[PDB]
Ligand binder design. Structure first.
Ligand code: NAG
Ligand code: NAG
Lengths: 65, 65
């Protein structure tokens, strides 16, 4: 269309959400959602940030401080 | 999702590549990117420290608080 932009690196996307005991992860392959949990031992996740250089995920916990 | 406080998206497109000003620096505590030209970098000491005229070094305390 000469107006839309798409990513050269594969369209596959990773989306991460923080919900109390789970760092929910969704993997959008094609347009199919795939849902799994990153870590078992977490208590109350509040803030999530992603680091591309190491390939790491950072999160803060309200109960563990 | 019962308690979705935080959300992050993880793709190579969300952390675009850029040259690093700090790689050239050698200050002893912290190097931070800066909008000010031409260095585009500045150095920061721990909370409570001073910064010497030698912009790459820091001095500590010596005053009541
Ligand atoms: C997402 O899912 C695909 C297919 O299961 C997999 O190849 C990929 O490694 C997963 N993670 C990312 C970041 O794409
Ligand atoms: C830095 O040193 C000066 C004395 O030269 C002192 O008065 C000052 O309080 C120190 N730093 C700060 C902002 O506390």
């Amino acid at each position: 269309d000469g107006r839309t932009c798409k990513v050269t690196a594969s369209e596959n996307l990773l989306l991460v959400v923080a919900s109390r005991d789970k760092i929910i992860m969704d993997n959008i392959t094609a347009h199919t959602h795939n849902i799994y949990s990153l870590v078992q031992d977490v208590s109350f996740v509040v803030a999530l940030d992603f680091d591309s250089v190491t390939g790491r995920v950072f999160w803060s916990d309200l109960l563990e401080g | 999702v019962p308690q979705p406080l935080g959300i992050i998206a993880i793709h190579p497109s969300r952390q675009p590549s850029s040259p690093n000003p700090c790689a050239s620096a050698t200050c002893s505590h912290l190097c931070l990117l800066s909008a000010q030209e031409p260095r585009h970098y500045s150095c920061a000491c721990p909370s409570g420290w001073n910064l010497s005229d030698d912009s790459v070094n820091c001095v500590r305390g010596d005053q009541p608080f």
